[PDB]
Design a protein. Structure first.
Length: 111
């Protein structure tokens, strides 16, 4: 029984590698009793979501200055289709996923 520690390390890894890293684990482990905190129904989800934000933003101070980013826009009718995940960020999240499971002490799997 170690879900609090799994949530801590998973939140650190998701905060580093983005919301697609959450989707990678959530699709692979959707019903797993250790990983169910990625579903919104769990008591652990509130701690998990807070830990991702903590890992993202930290607690370091910074002063506010200048005009707000709500002013203006990038341009009228600037819509475009989404790009595929063909970048090196895919090979990164694939290896970082192995590294998470290895640090949690979870079982390896062959290619």
């Amino acid at each position: 029984g170690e879900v609090r520690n799994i949530v801590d390390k998973t939140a650190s890894f998701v905060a580093r590698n983005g919301p697609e890293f959450e989707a990678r684990i959530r699709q692979n482990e959707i019903n797993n009793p250790k990983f169910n905190f990625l579903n919104p129904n769990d008591p652990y989800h509130a701690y998990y979501r807070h830990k991702v934000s903590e890992f993202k933003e930290g607690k370091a101070q910074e002063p506010s200055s200048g005009s707000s980013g709500s002013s203006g826009s990038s341009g009228s009718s600037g819509q475009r289709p989404g790009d595929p995940q063909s970048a090196q960020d895919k090979a990164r999240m694939d290896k970082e996923y192995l590294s998470l499971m290895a640090e949690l002490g979870e079982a390896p799997v062959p290619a």
